[PDB]
Design a protein around this ligand. Sequence first.
Ligand SMILES: CC1(C)c2[nH]c3cc(Cl)c(Cl)cc3c2C[C@@]23CN4CCC[C@]4(C[C@@H]12)C(=O)N3
Ligand SMILES: [Ca+2]
Ligand SMILES: [Ca+2]
Ligand SMILES: [Ca+2]
Ligand SMILES: [Ca+2]
Ligand SMILES: [Zn+2]
Length: 142
Amino acid sequence: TEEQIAEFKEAFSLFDKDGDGTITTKELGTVMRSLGQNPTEAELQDMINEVDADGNGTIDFPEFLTMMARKMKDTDSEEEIREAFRVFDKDGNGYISAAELRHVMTNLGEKLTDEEVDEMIREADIDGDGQVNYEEFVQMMT
Ligand SMILES: CC1(C)c2[nH]c3cc(Cl)c(Cl)cc3c2C[C@@]23CN4CCC[C@]4(C[C@@H]12)C(=O)N3
Ligand SMILES: [Ca+2]
Ligand SMILES: [Ca+2]
Ligand SMILES: [Ca+2]
Ligand SMILES: [Ca+2]
Ligand SMILES: [Zn+2]
């Protein structure tokens, strides 16, 4: 929803007391304690680490959407990698062929040669079927 998001940026701004675009443990604890909870500092750090995709100890708005989605960061990252994968998997069959890779990359401004493309598919083609599936796409990227 679009207004579910607008609600969420409202929430984020409230929690981000000082407006610097990040939520700290202290800001998080203030909110938790205002709702009748007594989380330890370790527990507050844990809440943050669970969505802390960039590893900087604070929550920004994109990581907060993970938290509002309630999710863990690996789950969230998997859903984002799958969205990138579907950009390349034009026919939607679950495999990035060499032609799909060449086509999408060209239309995104990167034209590689034919044998660059064939080697990119080869490199990430673990099981040797000639195409790049999702798990191979994840691996390729790490
Ligand atoms: C040139 C890159 C490294 C790459 N190399 C590939 C090899 C294969 Cl086999 C396939 Cl299918 C796709 C790619 C892509 C698309 C990528 C994925 N990377 C993730 C982080 C940055 C970057 C760079 C770029 C990105 O944003 N787009
Ligand atoms: Ca802040
Ligand atoms: Ca962060
Ligand atoms: Ca495909
Ligand atoms: Ca494969
Ligand atoms: Zn995310």
